[PDB]
Amino acid sequence: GDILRPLSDSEVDELLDLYKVKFGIRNFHYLLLYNQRKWDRQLSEAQIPRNDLNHISLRKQFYTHRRGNFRTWGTYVSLHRDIVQSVSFFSWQPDGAAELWECLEQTQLIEWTQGALLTNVDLGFCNRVKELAVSRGVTAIQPRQCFGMVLSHEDAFCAKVPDLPSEFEIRRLRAEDAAMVHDSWPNKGEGSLTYLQALVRFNKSLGICRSDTGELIAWIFQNDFSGLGMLQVLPKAERRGLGGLLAAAMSREIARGEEITLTAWIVATNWRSEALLKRIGYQKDLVNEWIKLVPNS
Question: What's the total number of domains in the chain?
Answer without folding.
Answer: 2
